[PDB]
Amino acid sequence: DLEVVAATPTSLLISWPPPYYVEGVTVFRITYGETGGNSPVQEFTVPYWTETATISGLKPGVDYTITVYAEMYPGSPWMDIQPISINYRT
Amino acid sequence: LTEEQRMMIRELMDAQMKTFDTTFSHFKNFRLPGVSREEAAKWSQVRKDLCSLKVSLQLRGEDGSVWNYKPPADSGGKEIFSLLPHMADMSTYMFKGIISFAKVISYFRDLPIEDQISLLKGAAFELCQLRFNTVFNAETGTWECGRLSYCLEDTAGGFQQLLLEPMLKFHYMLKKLQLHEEEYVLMQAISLFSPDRPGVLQHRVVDQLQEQFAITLKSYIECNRPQPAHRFLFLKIMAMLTELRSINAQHTQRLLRIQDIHPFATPLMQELF
């Protein structure tokens, strides 16, 4: 599961459970894009320990798509997949 | 060189090769430049921190087109910043590599997770700097980073001016040593495990590891380096590492000052610091 702990119309706070397949993971890539897009996707990355992320500058009233990718130091694994995804609206 | 030492070096070598992209082939999508209060006098200090850095940037095409960027002279402006967004992306890309490199090592994975976090946060800039050095060209005064290159401006100024900044001096001095890849990799290991670093419960375990690596570095040089010249060399490298830790502290202060008037930092950088 991926959760939004809090929202404001601009801004998001989001959480995920730790895996499971860590160590596995060097970092989490995070992508948020407008939910089906004109928008270019935005991705940023955080350390494997981090359970929490902030997304900012969002438009009000817009449905959104948020994707988390967990990134594996070469030949872990734990395979592979999934990216885990959610949609939220201003 | 004990079978264990040889094994230790082998593991480090593997991690770097997986860990580290010398090409910077996979470095993509970076930002590019051009693309009354008081606080201020914070600004005058901030300008000083920026001033030391400043570099030309060159991009090489798949075409073999070259793009050259020359940074503005200071002004007020907020000109000074312009590189900063690009720099953060490069640091962020480097950091991801650094984190993997730690992850690969068996000893690091073994460590209690809180300890990993403390070490990585302490380590990360120093390791990143060490990786940069391998790219660095003293004669050029350039870091060559695949298609990307960064070239130092000449203040003229001088070398005498240039050497004033600790980071620049360190790269030139480290480059002089002409280290083997094993030597560079060991340094990262010694840096990566520091007992000192803030937030570390498990001092005793780390210190042994750091010592064990240090001996391996000491052993390697004596066996592999033909001795008579090189008797010093281990001492100098250790000296460089000590210098690095101090430089790391200086950098950390600088970033905080820059951010506070200006924020560039990526989420990973904030997470890491």
Coordinates of C-alpha atoms in Angstrom, one line a residue:
Chain A
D1 CA 0.0 0.0 0.0
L2 CA 1.0 3.6 -0.6
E3 CA -0.7 6.2 1.5
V4 CA -1.2 10.0 1.6
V5 CA -0.8 10.9 5.2
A6 CA -1.8 14.5 4.5
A7 CA -2.8 16.8 1.6
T8 CA -3.1 20.4 0.8
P9 CA -4.2 21.6 -2.6
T10 CA -0.7 22.6 -3.5
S11 CA 1.0 19.9 -1.7
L12 CA 1.2 16.2 -0.7
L13 CA 2.6 14.1 2.1
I14 CA 3.0 10.4 1.2
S15 CA 4.1 7.2 2.8
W16 CA 5.0 3.6 1.9
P17 CA 5.6 0.5 3.9
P18 CA 9.2 -0.7 4.0
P19 CA 9.8 -3.9 2.1
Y20 CA 10.2 -6.9 2.3
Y21 CA 13.0 -6.8 -0.3
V22 CA 15.4 -4.7 1.5
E23 CA 18.3 -4.5 1.8
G24 CA 17.6 -4.8 -1.9
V25 CA 17.4 -1.2 -2.5
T26 CA 19.8 1.6 -3.0
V27 CA 17.1 4.3 -3.4
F28 CA 13.4 4.9 -4.2
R29 CA 12.7 6.8 -7.3
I30 CA 9.5 8.7 -7.0
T31 CA 7.4 9.8 -10.0
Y32 CA 4.4 12.0 -9.8
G33 CA 2.6 13.0 -13.0
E34 CA -0.8 14.5 -13.8
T35 CA -2.9 11.5 -13.8
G36 CA -3.2 11.0 -17.4
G37 CA -1.0 13.5 -18.8
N38 CA -0.4 16.4 -20.9
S39 CA 2.1 16.7 -18.1
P40 CA 5.7 15.5 -18.2
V41 CA 6.3 13.1 -15.3
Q42 CA 8.4 14.2 -12.4
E43 CA 10.8 11.9 -10.6
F44 CA 13.0 12.3 -7.6
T45 CA 14.9 9.9 -5.4
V46 CA 15.4 9.2 -1.7
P47 CA 17.5 7.0 0.4
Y48 CA 16.4 3.4 1.0
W49 CA 15.7 4.1 4.7
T50 CA 13.2 6.8 3.9
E51 CA 9.5 5.8 4.4
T52 CA 8.1 9.3 3.6
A53 CA 8.1 11.8 0.8
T54 CA 6.9 15.4 0.0
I55 CA 5.3 16.5 -3.2
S56 CA 4.8 20.1 -3.8
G57 CA 3.7 22.7 -6.4
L58 CA 0.6 20.7 -7.3
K59 CA -2.4 22.2 -9.1
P60 CA -5.7 22.2 -7.3
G61 CA -8.5 20.0 -8.4
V62 CA -6.3 17.6 -10.3
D63 CA -6.4 14.2 -10.4
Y64 CA -2.9 12.8 -10.2
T65 CA -0.9 9.7 -10.6
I66 CA 1.9 8.9 -8.2
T67 CA 4.4 6.1 -8.7
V68 CA 7.2 4.7 -6.5
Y69 CA 10.0 2.6 -7.9
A70 CA 12.4 0.8 -5.6
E71 CA 15.9 0.5 -6.9
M72 CA 18.2 -2.4 -6.4
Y73 CA 21.9 -2.6 -5.8
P74 CA 23.3 -4.7 -8.5
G75 CA 22.3 -8.4 -8.1
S76 CA 20.4 -8.4 -4.9
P77 CA 17.4 -8.9 -5.6
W78 CA 15.3 -9.0 -2.6
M79 CA 12.0 -10.9 -8.0
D80 CA 11.6 -7.9 -9.2
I81 CA 8.4 -6.2 -9.4
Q82 CA 6.1 -3.9 -8.9
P83 CA 6.1 -0.2 -9.0
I84 CA 3.3 0.9 -6.7
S85 CA 0.9 3.6 -7.8
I86 CA -1.9 5.9 -6.5
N87 CA -4.1 8.8 -7.8
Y88 CA -5.1 11.9 -5.8
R89 CA -7.0 15.0 -6.5
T90 CA -6.6 18.7 -5.5
Chain B
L1 CA 48.9 -10.1 1.7
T2 CA 46.6 -12.3 3.7
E3 CA 43.9 -14.3 1.8
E4 CA 41.4 -12.3 3.7
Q5 CA 43.0 -9.0 2.7
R6 CA 43.1 -10.1 -1.0
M7 CA 39.5 -11.0 -0.7
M8 CA 38.6 -7.7 0.9
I9 CA 40.2 -5.8 -2.0
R10 CA 38.4 -8.0 -4.5
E11 CA 35.1 -7.2 -3.0
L12 CA 35.8 -3.4 -3.0
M13 CA 36.9 -3.6 -6.7
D14 CA 33.7 -5.4 -7.6
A15 CA 31.6 -2.8 -5.8
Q16 CA 33.2 0.1 -7.5
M17 CA 32.8 -1.4 -11.0
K18 CA 29.1 -2.1 -10.4
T19 CA 28.8 1.0 -8.2
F20 CA 30.5 3.6 -10.4
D21 CA 29.8 4.8 -13.9
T22 CA 33.1 6.3 -15.1
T23 CA 31.4 7.2 -18.4
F24 CA 28.5 9.0 -16.9
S25 CA 26.5 7.4 -19.8
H26 CA 23.5 7.1 -17.6
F27 CA 23.6 10.7 -16.3
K28 CA 20.7 12.3 -18.1
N29 CA 17.9 14.9 -17.7
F30 CA 20.1 17.3 -15.7
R31 CA 19.2 21.0 -15.6
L32 CA 21.4 23.5 -17.4
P33 CA 22.2 27.2 -16.8
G34 CA 20.4 29.6 -19.2
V35 CA 17.9 26.9 -19.9
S36 CA 17.9 45.7 1.9
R37 CA 17.0 43.0 3.2
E38 CA 19.4 42.2 5.6
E39 CA 19.9 39.0 5.9
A40 CA 22.2 40.2 3.3
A41 CA 25.9 40.2 4.0
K42 CA 25.0 36.8 4.6
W43 CA 25.2 37.3 0.9
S44 CA 28.8 38.6 1.0
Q45 CA 29.8 35.4 2.7
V46 CA 27.7 33.4 0.3
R47 CA 29.4 35.1 -2.6
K48 CA 32.7 34.0 -1.2
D49 CA 31.6 30.4 -1.0
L50 CA 30.4 30.5 -4.6
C51 CA 33.5 32.3 -5.8
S52 CA 35.8 29.3 -5.0
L53 CA 33.7 26.9 -7.0
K54 CA 33.3 28.5 -10.2
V55 CA 33.8 26.4 -13.4
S56 CA 33.3 26.4 -17.1
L57 CA 31.0 23.7 -18.4
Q58 CA 31.4 21.8 -21.7
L59 CA 29.0 19.4 -23.4
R60 CA 30.0 17.1 -26.2
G61 CA 27.4 16.0 -28.8
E62 CA 26.7 12.6 -30.2
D63 CA 27.2 14.7 -33.3
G64 CA 30.5 15.9 -32.0
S65 CA 29.0 19.3 -31.5
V66 CA 30.4 21.0 -28.5
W67 CA 28.5 23.4 -26.3
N68 CA 30.5 25.7 -24.0
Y69 CA 29.1 27.6 -21.0
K70 CA 31.0 30.4 -19.4
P71 CA 29.7 31.6 -16.0
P72 CA 28.8 35.2 -15.3
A73 CA 31.1 37.5 -13.3
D74 CA 29.6 38.1 -10.0
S75 CA 27.4 41.2 -10.1
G76 CA 24.9 41.1 -7.4
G77 CA 23.1 39.1 -9.2
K78 CA 21.8 35.9 -8.2
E79 CA 23.8 35.3 -11.3
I80 CA 26.1 33.3 -9.0
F81 CA 23.5 30.6 -8.5
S82 CA 23.0 29.6 -12.1
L83 CA 25.1 26.4 -12.1
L84 CA 23.6 25.3 -8.8
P85 CA 20.6 23.5 -10.1
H86 CA 22.8 21.5 -12.5
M87 CA 25.3 20.8 -9.7
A88 CA 22.7 19.4 -7.5
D89 CA 21.6 16.9 -10.2
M90 CA 25.2 15.8 -10.7
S91 CA 25.7 15.4 -6.9
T92 CA 22.4 13.5 -6.7
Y93 CA 23.5 11.2 -9.5
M94 CA 26.8 10.7 -7.8
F95 CA 25.2 10.0 -4.5
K96 CA 23.0 7.3 -5.9
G97 CA 26.2 5.6 -7.0
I98 CA 27.8 6.1 -3.6
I99 CA 24.9 4.5 -1.8
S100 CA 25.0 1.4 -4.0
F101 CA 28.7 1.1 -3.5
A102 CA 28.1 0.9 0.2
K103 CA 25.2 -1.5 -0.3
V104 CA 27.2 -4.0 -2.2
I105 CA 29.8 -4.5 0.6
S106 CA 29.0 -7.5 2.8
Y107 CA 30.4 -5.8 5.9
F108 CA 28.3 -2.7 5.4
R109 CA 25.1 -4.7 4.9
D110 CA 25.8 -6.6 8.2
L111 CA 25.9 -3.3 10.1
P112 CA 22.9 -2.3 12.1
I113 CA 20.6 -0.2 9.9
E114 CA 20.9 3.0 12.0
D115 CA 24.6 2.7 11.7
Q116 CA 24.4 2.4 8.0
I117 CA 22.4 5.6 7.9
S118 CA 24.9 7.5 10.0
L119 CA 27.9 6.3 8.0
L120 CA 26.4 7.0 4.6
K121 CA 25.4 10.5 5.7
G122 CA 28.9 11.2 7.0
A123 CA 30.6 9.4 4.1
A124 CA 28.8 10.5 1.2
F125 CA 30.4 13.8 0.2
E126 CA 33.9 12.4 0.8
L127 CA 33.3 9.3 -1.3
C128 CA 31.8 11.4 -4.0
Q129 CA 34.9 13.6 -4.0
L130 CA 37.2 10.6 -4.2
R131 CA 35.3 9.3 -7.3
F132 CA 35.6 12.7 -8.9
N133 CA 39.4 12.7 -8.4
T134 CA 39.7 9.8 -10.8
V135 CA 38.2 11.9 -13.5
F136 CA 40.2 14.9 -12.5
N137 CA 43.0 16.1 -14.8
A138 CA 45.7 18.2 -13.1
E139 CA 47.3 19.5 -16.3
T140 CA 43.9 20.3 -17.8
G141 CA 42.4 21.5 -14.6
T142 CA 39.4 19.7 -15.7
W143 CA 37.1 17.0 -14.5
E144 CA 36.1 14.8 -17.4
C145 CA 32.7 13.2 -16.9
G146 CA 31.7 11.4 -20.1
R147 CA 30.3 13.9 -22.4
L148 CA 30.3 16.5 -19.6
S149 CA 33.4 18.3 -18.6
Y150 CA 34.0 20.9 -16.0
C151 CA 37.0 23.2 -16.3
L152 CA 38.3 25.6 -13.6
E153 CA 38.4 29.3 -14.3
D154 CA 41.8 31.1 -13.9
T155 CA 41.4 33.9 -11.4
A156 CA 45.0 34.9 -12.1
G157 CA 44.7 35.0 -9.3
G158 CA 47.1 32.1 -9.7
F159 CA 47.7 28.6 -8.5
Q160 CA 48.6 30.4 -5.3
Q161 CA 45.1 31.9 -5.2
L162 CA 43.7 28.6 -6.5
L163 CA 45.3 26.5 -3.8
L164 CA 43.8 28.7 -1.2
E165 CA 40.5 26.8 -1.4
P166 CA 40.9 23.5 0.4
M167 CA 38.9 21.4 -2.1
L168 CA 40.9 22.5 -5.1
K169 CA 44.1 21.9 -3.3
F170 CA 43.0 18.5 -2.2
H171 CA 42.2 17.4 -5.7
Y172 CA 45.6 18.5 -7.0
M173 CA 47.4 17.0 -4.1
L174 CA 45.5 13.7 -4.3
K175 CA 46.1 13.6 -8.1
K176 CA 49.8 13.9 -7.5
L177 CA 49.9 10.6 -5.6
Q178 CA 49.0 8.7 -8.8
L179 CA 47.1 6.1 -6.9
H180 CA 46.1 2.7 -8.2
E181 CA 42.4 1.9 -8.4
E182 CA 42.8 -0.4 -5.4
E183 CA 44.3 2.5 -3.4
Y184 CA 41.3 4.8 -4.4
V185 CA 38.8 2.1 -3.5
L186 CA 40.4 1.4 -0.2
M187 CA 40.2 5.0 0.7
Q188 CA 36.5 5.0 0.1
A189 CA 36.3 2.0 2.4
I190 CA 38.3 3.7 5.1
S191 CA 36.3 6.8 4.7
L192 CA 33.0 4.9 4.4
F193 CA 33.6 3.3 7.8
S194 CA 34.5 6.0 10.2
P195 CA 33.8 5.2 13.9
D196 CA 33.7 9.0 14.6
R197 CA 30.7 9.9 12.6
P198 CA 27.7 11.4 14.3
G199 CA 24.9 9.1 15.3
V200 CA 26.9 5.8 15.4
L201 CA 26.1 3.4 18.2
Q202 CA 28.4 0.6 17.1
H203 CA 31.8 2.3 17.5
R204 CA 33.7 -0.8 18.3
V205 CA 32.7 -2.9 15.3
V206 CA 33.3 0.0 12.9
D207 CA 36.7 0.8 14.3
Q208 CA 37.9 -2.7 13.7
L209 CA 36.6 -2.6 10.1
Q210 CA 38.2 0.7 9.5
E211 CA 41.4 -0.5 11.0
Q212 CA 41.3 -3.7 9.1
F213 CA 40.9 -1.8 5.8
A214 CA 43.7 0.5 6.8
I215 CA 46.1 -2.4 7.4
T216 CA 45.0 -3.7 4.0
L217 CA 45.9 -0.4 2.4
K218 CA 49.2 -0.4 4.3
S219 CA 49.9 -4.0 3.3
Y220 CA 49.1 -3.4 -0.3
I221 CA 51.5 -0.6 -0.8
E222 CA 54.4 -2.5 0.7
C223 CA 53.8 -5.5 -1.5
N224 CA 52.7 -3.8 -4.6
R225 CA 54.7 -0.6 -4.5
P226 CA 58.4 -0.7 -5.1
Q227 CA 59.3 0.1 -1.8
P228 CA 62.0 2.6 -1.4
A229 CA 60.3 5.7 -2.7
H230 CA 56.9 4.7 -1.3
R231 CA 57.5 4.2 2.4
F232 CA 55.7 7.4 3.1
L233 CA 52.8 6.9 0.9
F234 CA 50.4 5.3 3.3
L235 CA 50.9 8.1 5.7
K236 CA 50.2 10.7 3.1
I237 CA 47.0 9.0 2.0
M238 CA 45.9 8.9 5.6
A239 CA 46.7 12.5 5.9
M240 CA 44.6 13.2 2.8
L241 CA 41.6 11.4 4.4
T242 CA 41.9 13.5 7.5
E243 CA 42.0 16.6 5.3
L244 CA 38.9 15.3 3.6
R245 CA 36.9 15.0 6.8
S246 CA 37.7 18.6 7.6
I247 CA 36.8 19.7 4.0
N248 CA 33.6 17.8 4.4
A249 CA 32.7 19.9 7.4
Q250 CA 33.5 23.0 5.5
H251 CA 31.3 22.0 2.6
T252 CA 28.4 21.2 4.9
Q253 CA 28.5 24.7 6.4
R254 CA 28.7 26.2 2.9
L255 CA 25.6 24.3 1.7
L256 CA 23.6 25.4 4.7
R257 CA 24.5 29.0 4.1
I258 CA 23.8 28.8 0.4
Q259 CA 20.5 27.0 1.0
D260 CA 19.2 29.4 3.6
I261 CA 19.4 32.5 1.4
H262 CA 19.1 30.1 -1.5
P263 CA 17.7 26.6 -1.8
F264 CA 18.9 24.3 -4.5
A265 CA 19.0 21.0 -2.7
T266 CA 17.4 17.9 -4.1
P267 CA 15.3 15.7 -1.8
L268 CA 18.0 13.1 -1.6
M269 CA 20.5 15.7 -0.6
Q270 CA 18.2 16.9 2.1
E271 CA 17.7 13.4 3.2
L272 CA 21.4 12.8 3.1
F273 CA 22.0 16.0 5.1

